Design an enzyme around this catalytic site. Sequence first.
Site, short mmCIF file in Angstrom:
data_model
loop_
_atom_site.label_atom_id
_atom_site.label_comp_id
_atom_site.label_asym_id
_atom_site.label_seq_id
_atom_site.Cartn_x
_atom_site.Cartn_y
_atom_site.Cartn_z
N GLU A 145 0.86 -1.18 0.00
CA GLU A 145 0.00 0.00 0.00
C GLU A 145 0.89 1.22 0.00
OE1 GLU A 145 -2.81 -0.16 3.17
OE2 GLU A 145 -4.47 -0.83 1.89
N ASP A 190 -10.21 7.20 -3.62
CA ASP A 190 -10.85 5.98 -3.12
C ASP A 190 -10.80 4.83 -4.12
OD1 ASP A 190 -12.85 6.86 -4.96
OD2 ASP A 190 -14.37 5.78 -3.80
#
Lengths: 210, 282, 314, 123, 185, 256, 235, 235
Positions: free
Chosen positions: E94, E103
Site C-alpha cells: 500500500e 478511493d
Amino acid sequence: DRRRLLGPAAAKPMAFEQELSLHTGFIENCNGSALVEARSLGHQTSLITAVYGPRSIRGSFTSQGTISIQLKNGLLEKYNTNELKEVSSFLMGIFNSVVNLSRYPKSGIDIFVYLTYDKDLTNSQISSLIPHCITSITLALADAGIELVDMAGAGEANGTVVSFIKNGEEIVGFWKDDGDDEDLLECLDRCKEQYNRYRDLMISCLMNQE
Amino acid sequence: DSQIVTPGELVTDDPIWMRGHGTYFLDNMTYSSVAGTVSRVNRLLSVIPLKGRYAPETGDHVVGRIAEVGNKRWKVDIGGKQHAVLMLGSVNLPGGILRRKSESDELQMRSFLKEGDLLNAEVQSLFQDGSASLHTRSLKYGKLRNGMFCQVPSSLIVRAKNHTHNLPGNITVVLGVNGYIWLRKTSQMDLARDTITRLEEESSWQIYSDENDPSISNNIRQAICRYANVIKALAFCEIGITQQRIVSAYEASMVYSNVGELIEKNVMESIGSDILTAEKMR
Amino acid sequence: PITFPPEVLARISPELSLQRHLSLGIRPCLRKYEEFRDVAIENNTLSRYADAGNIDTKNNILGSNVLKSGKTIVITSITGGIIEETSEDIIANYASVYPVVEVERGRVGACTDEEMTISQKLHDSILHSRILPKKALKVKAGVRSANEDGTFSVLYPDKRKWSYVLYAKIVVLSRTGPVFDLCWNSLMYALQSVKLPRAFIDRETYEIICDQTKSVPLMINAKNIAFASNYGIVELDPECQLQNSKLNTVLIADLDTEAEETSIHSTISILAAPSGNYKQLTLMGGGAKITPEMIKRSLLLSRVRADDLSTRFN
Amino acid sequence: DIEIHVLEQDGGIMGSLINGITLALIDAGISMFDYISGISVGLYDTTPLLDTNSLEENAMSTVTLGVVGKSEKLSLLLVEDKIPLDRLENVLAIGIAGAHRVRDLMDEELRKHAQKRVSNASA
Amino acid sequence: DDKLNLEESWKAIKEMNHYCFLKNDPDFAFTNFIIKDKKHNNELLGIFVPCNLPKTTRKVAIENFNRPSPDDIIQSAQLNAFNMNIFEMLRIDEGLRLKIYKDTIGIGHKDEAEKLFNQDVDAAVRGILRNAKLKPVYDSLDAVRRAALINMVAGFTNSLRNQTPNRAKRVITTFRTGTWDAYKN
Amino acid sequence: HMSLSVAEKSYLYDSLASTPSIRPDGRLPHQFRPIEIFTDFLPSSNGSSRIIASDGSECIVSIKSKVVDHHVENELLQVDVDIAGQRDDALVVETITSLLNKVLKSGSGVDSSKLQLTKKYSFKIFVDVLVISSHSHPISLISFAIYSALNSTYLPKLILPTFHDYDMVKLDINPPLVFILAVVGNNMLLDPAANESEVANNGLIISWSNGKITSPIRSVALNDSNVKSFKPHLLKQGLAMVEKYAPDVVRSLENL
Amino acid sequence: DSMSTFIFPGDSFPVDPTTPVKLGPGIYCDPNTQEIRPVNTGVLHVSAKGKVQTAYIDYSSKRYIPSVNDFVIGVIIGTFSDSYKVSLQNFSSSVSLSYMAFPNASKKNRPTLQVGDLVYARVCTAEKELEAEIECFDSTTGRDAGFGILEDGMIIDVNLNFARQLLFNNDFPLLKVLAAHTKFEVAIGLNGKIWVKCEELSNTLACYRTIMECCQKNDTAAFKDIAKRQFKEIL
Amino acid sequence: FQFPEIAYPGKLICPQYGTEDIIFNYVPGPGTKLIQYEHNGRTLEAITATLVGTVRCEEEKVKNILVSVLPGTNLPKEGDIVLTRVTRLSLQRANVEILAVEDKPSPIDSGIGSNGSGIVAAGGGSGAATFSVSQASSDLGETFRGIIRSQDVRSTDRDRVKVIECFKPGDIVRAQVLSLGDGTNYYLTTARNDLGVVFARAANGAGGLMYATDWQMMTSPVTGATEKRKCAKPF
Ligand code: NA
Ligand code: NA
C-alpha cells in the site's frame, strides 16, 4: 512394640442450658485452631481442633479439596475406635457439604479433634459431644482461612444430633442412634435453638477474635 | 465348528505353520497356551481365547474416558489391558488448521480435556506392548455430551462400516468396539449423515464444551433409558449388538409401557428370544 | 524494597534471620540471649484423686500435669499397672516410668524419631537421676476377707511379691522448638502429684485388684528431682550483621522459633537439681566451638533455672 | 491381581489354592504353558494316604505337590513336618498320579464349559 | 416468577445476615490457662545486603538494576524490528504519500506520521484480540504470519483456503512460508 | 458408574431432579433392582447367606455361635465386616461395622432373650460379612444378606450346659433391615445405582425392625463432589417412603 | 613435593604457600574459611611443576564418582527419548548417554544398544549440579574413538585404585602375566570395572579368577604365581 | 443498599446485579461464591463471603465489578507468586519446592527436629517409613513441588537457556505459577524482572550468602568472586 516403651508384658493395667467458651488461633504449628469448652449442670466438656492445610496429596491429580477428619481420645480412652471413625465419617460428610472444595484442587485439608476433657458428674455420650466437635471444626476452618459456604452448626436432643446451615433452613447433618423414641419435630426445634445460639456465639467469637 | 483346545495341549506336530497368539512351540510341536478355539488363517495358526479384554487394533473406533492428564498427552481408559495414549498433536484444537503449536495450550490442556471426560476417538497406531495410540482429528471425534454412558463386553460388539447410528426417537448411538457405548440426543451433525452445512460444521467451534443441550425433552430421556436397558438386555442374553438388533430390541420392548420393567431377568430373556426368533423367521 | 514476614524469612533463610536478629541483641523468638520462656502449670487436674471429696470412679489417671511455656502446651498423664515380681545408691535398685510422647504435628501414623528419642531419654534420665527407687514401687497387698457370711471387707497391713508399674502419656500441642525440656519438667511435676492406689487380694492363681478410693503417696527422692534447660552457641557472621544506625560467639537460652532450631547446631542440654548437683549433661558441637566458658555459663543458668522451676510453685 | 477367598477349610488347602488359581487364570484367557495341579499326601506309618482331610493332616506329616501338566516335573514341593527320607519318594509317586487325576478333572470341566459357551454363542 | 426484586433481594439479604452479636466473652480456668500473657529497622526482613559493602558499589548495583534487563533489550529490539517490518510490508503493498486520497493518510488511511500508522496497526491488533474466535490463532502465530494476519485485518473471511496489484501472492505466501522473502526484492 | 464427566453428571442430575424423576434405567423412585439370594450353603456355620445384585455387587454372610457368660460378655452379637480391596483399618469398613453393630445390638436391635440358655450362659452370635464386590454403599446389601442368614440360622439345642448331638433348633428372631436412600434435589430414591450415587445431593441410612422405623438413622454423603444440604421435609419423605415400602421387602425376604 | 607423604583429614597441609598449586582429589578448599584442608586419608602426592604443581591424595576407595575424561564401563538399564540410562556402579546415581553421542549418528540413524548391554565410554560431563554424561565418540570430530559396545565378555568388580593402576601404570605386571598365558581383550573402566574376553570360555574364566584374586592381594610380586596356579586350571 | 464491610462465612454481601442507572454485574472473587439461596418459597441469587475479613469491590476492565474478601482488617494458584527452594537441576528443567505462597509459609510446620539431631530431609527419618497414606494427605514436612522448565526461565532467547547459569541447588527463587500441572508438580516461571533468584550461597549452598549485583550475576562479599544466576530485581 518396637517404637514405644510399653514396659513389661507380664504387667496388667490397673482395674478398680450450657455455657460456652470459644477461642481461635492459639496453636502455632498449624493453619487453624479452636478451643471449645462447655459447662452444663453436673457436666463439663472441653475439646480442641487443629486444621493443617491446604497441604499436598500423594496420588493422582484431584479436581477439588480432600478433607480428612481424625478424632483423638483425650485422657481416658473413652470411646471405641469404630465409633470414633463413624463420627469422623459423619463430620466428613457435613464439612464436605460446607467447605468450598472447588478452591483447593490437588490439595488436602487434615482436621484433628482432640477430646481432651469429658467429665459429666451425672450418675453413648458421643451424641452430646458431636455438636461441639462441629462448632470447633467450623471455628478452626474459619481460623485457618479455609473457605466455608456457611457456618456449620448443630444441636443435640434425645440422642438426636442435627447439624444445620443457612439459619437452620436446611440440614447438612443428621445423626440418630437409639437414645429413646420421640417424635422428630421437637428434637428438630431444640437442636435448631442450640444451633442458632452456637451460631451467634461462633460469629461473635469470629468478630472479637480472628 | 472349530477344535476346542486347552493349555498345554498339542495342536499340531507340523512345523510348517506360523504361530499366532494362544500358542507356543517346541521344535515341530505346537501347543496351546489358552482355552479356546483353533484358528487357521492362511499359514497363521493361532488359538482364540473364549474370554479376554479388548485388544485395540489400528483403525478401531472406540469410546474412552480421560484417566490422566500428563506431559503433552492424555491417558485414556478404553477397557483394554493398558491405558491408551492421546498425544496433544493428535487432537483438534478449537478452530481451523491455522493455529500452530503453542506452549500456552500445553499449559491449559485441562481446558480441552480433563480427568473424567468421555470422548470418542480412533486408534491411530499401536505401541510395542499393544497399547493404543489415539487421535480425534475427525469432526466426528471429540468430547461426548447430551446423553448417558453404558458398557457391554467388547466381544458382543459386532462390527460394520460405521458405529455411530441414528435411532428412532431422535437418539444417536455410539458403539465403541471396546464395548463402551454412548447414547445421546441426535445433533444436527448426526442429522447430516445423508448420502448451511459448512456453518453447521464450523458451529461446533466448541468441541471441548462441558455443557449439554439446554433443551433435552423428557421423551428423549425416556428413550435413552429404554435404549440403555435393551442394550443391556441384549448383553445379558449374550446377543451380538448391531444397529438393527438395537432398534428391534427397542420396538419389541415397547410392549412394556414402563421402561423399568426392562431390568427384570425374564423380560431381558424375552426380548432376546424375540429378536432371535424374528431374525430366524425373516 | 522487597520484604519477607519473619515467618517466611525463617523458612527461607533461617541462618540469615538468626544472625540478623542477633545483630540487634535479640532473637527471632523476640527474647534476648539468656531470657527463658515463662512457664505456667495446672497440676493434678486430670487425676482421679483430683477431688478428695468426690473421687472420679471412671478415671484411671494416677497423676496429672498441664504445662505451658511460650505458646507450647504439654499435657502429661500418669496411669499404672501391676506386675508379679519373680525370685544402696547403685543403679540396680532404681526404677523408671514408661512414657509415650506424642508431639502433635500434622502427621498421623507411627512414632517419629523425635517422639521415640524423647520417650526413651525421659525413661533413661528418670532411671539415672535416681528419682524413683524400686522399693517405692513395692505393693503391700491387703486381703479381702468375707464379712461374717454375707459380703466382704478388706484388711490392709498398717504370699507373693508385686510391683507397681507407672506409665506416662505426654502430648505436645503448638510445638515451636525442641520440646524435651518441657516434657521432662511436666513429667516431674506430674510425678510429684502421683498417688499409688492401694491393692488387695481374695498352678491356679487369683488376681490382685486395686482399691477404689484408698491411696498412698508415691514417695520419690525430692533431693534428686532435676529440671531441664537447653542452650545454643551461635557464631556471629560479620556480613549478616545489621548496621543498627574479629570473631564473636553468643550463648542463647531456651531455643525456639525454627530459625534457631534450623540454624543452631551447637547445643547444650542440662538436667540440674536445685541442690547444686547435675543429673544430666549433653554437649553437641555440630557447629561452633564449645568452649569451657560456655559450659560454665550453661551450668550456672541451668541451676538458676532449676531453683526457679522448683520454687515458683508452692 | 489374584484375589482368593477360602470360604471353607478341611485340610489340603494349599493344593486347593493352586487348583483354584489355575482354573481362574485359564478362565481369564491369560496365556500359560500348562495346567498346575495341586494335591496333598499324608504319610501314616508305612502307607501314604492321598488327599488328606483336616483330621488326617493332624497326627500325620503331609507333603504338598504342585505338578506341571501331565509331566513328572514339580512346580511346588512342600514338606513342613518331619518325614523319613527313605519313604519320601514313594509319597511323591502316588501324589503325582493323584495330581494328574486332578488335572483330568479341571480339564474335563473347562472343555464342557467351553463346549457349552461356544455352541450357544453361535446363532 | 420465582425470582425476587433487587429491593426484595436486598431485604432478604438483610434478614438472612442477621445474627445476635454479643460483646463479652463467657470457671473455664482451662481456656484462660491456654490464653495468657520495637523492630523499626526493616533492614532485617529484606534480601541479604552485606554489612561490609561500601555505598559506591551499592550505587553500582542499583544502577545496574535500573538499566533494562536482557529480556527488556531483546524484547524491545524485536518489537521495533517488528514495527519496521510490518510498515515495510504494508508499504510494499500500500503506497505511501501525504495529504491526498483517491478511493478504491500515507499508509492506507511528514513521514513521522508513521506514529499514526502504528496507531492504526495496534487498533487492528486491539480489534483482533477482542473477538474470541481469532484470539487462539493470533496468539499462536509467529511475528510474520501474525503480520500477514494484521495485514488482513468483516465479510472478508473465506475459510483460509489503499490497494496493491499483487498482495494475494505476497500475503498468502507470507502466511504459510512464514518469511518476508517475497517482499525483500 | 464412578468418575463420570461433568456433562454426564449434569445429564443424570437433570433427569433425576426433574418431576417426576427419570432414573437412568427407568426405575420408579421406590423400585429395587433384581437380586437373588442363596442360603444354607456353608455347613460348618450355623447360618449362611449369599446375595447377588444385578450390577455385580456380591456379598457373603456367615453366622456362627459360641457359648458365653452374659456377665463377662454383655454383647451377645458381634458384626465383623470384611470388604475386598479395603484394609480392615479403612474408615468406611469401620463405619459400616459400627453401624451394623448398632443395628444388631442385643440391647434393642434384636431380642436378647431368644439367645439365653441358662442364667449364666448363652450363645454369642458372630456375624461375619464378606463383601466380594460393591459399586455403591453396601449397607443395604449387607443388611439383607444378614437378614436372610439369620432367618435361616440353626443352633445346637440345650438339654455346665450339654447339647443334643444331632438335633438343632431354628434361631427365631426378627432381624432388622437397613435401607439406603439417595437425596437428589427434591426427590428420594431407593436402591441408588452407582451413577445415581455419584450425583446425589445426599443420602439417608434408615434402620427398620418389627414393622417400625428404628435407629440408627444417618445422613450419609454418597460422594464428595455434590454433597449439599437438604430440607427436613425430604427427611420426612425418606422415613415415610421406607415405612411405606418396607413391609414388602420384609415379606419378599421372609418368603422361602 | 616429589616425596609422597601419608596424611589424615584435619592434618596441616605441608606444601609451599607461595607456590601456586592446583588441587586434585582429597584436598578441599573450605567455602567459608578459604583454608586448604585435607579431607581424605591416604598418600599425599605432589607433581613436579609446570605451567603450578598438582596436589592430590591417593586414597583407598571402592565407590566411583564421575569426573571428566574418565574411561568408564557402564551397563544400559533404561531407554529414553533422546538418551540411554546407564549404570556405572550398582546403587549409584545413573549416568546419561545421548543418542547423538555416537559416531555417524543422526535423528534418522540411531544406535542399536539394548537394556543389559555393556558400554565402554568416556565421561564428557561431570557437573556437580547435573547428572553425569558419557559419550562413545570423539566429541571434536564425531568419529569413533575406540568406544562402544562390549559383547560376550565377563565383567570384574574391582577397587578404584587397582583400576587406575591398571590403566595408567605400565609397570603393572597383571596384564603382562595374563598375556603370558593367553590372548585376551580387555577394557579398563576407572569406575572399578574390568571387562575381559578370550576366544575360549575356559581362558576367560581363568582371567576372571586370577584378576579377582590379584585384586584381593596387596602384594604385586605374587601375581605371576597366582596366574600360574590359576591357569593350571584347578577345578 | 451499601455492601457490608465486615464479612464472615455464610454472610450474603449483595445480589447478582444492581442498578445505580447502569446495571453492575457482580463477580464472585477470592473469598466469595455465587450461591442461590431460597427465601419465601422463591429464589435469590447472592454473592456470599466464604472467609473472615474486609470485603472489597474493586473495578476492572452493564459494567461488572470484582467482589472479594481479604483476611485481616495458602494454596498455589495460577498467577500466584511463590517462593521456592531449588531441589534438583537438569538440562531441561529445574525442580523446586514451594516454601511460601504470597508471604505465607507452606506448610506451616516444616518438620524441623522431627527426625533427630543431624541434618535430615523432611522424610529422611523413621516417621517416613511408617506414614499412613490411607489416613493423611501427606507427611510432616511435605511441600508442594514445582517445576521451572528451561523455556519458562526467560522471556526471550528461550531456545538456548542454560539452567546451570540461572539457578543452583539451595537457591531461593521467586516464581509465578503458570499451570496447576499434575499431582506431583506445579509448573512455574521466572520470566519476569521481579522473578528469579532472591537468595543464593556460594559453592552451591556451602559458602556464605551472595548479593545480587547485576541482572545475571551475584557476588560473594568475603571472596569477591562472582557467580552467574538469574536474579530477581530487588526494590
Ligand atoms: Na485434593
Ligand atoms: Na498338573
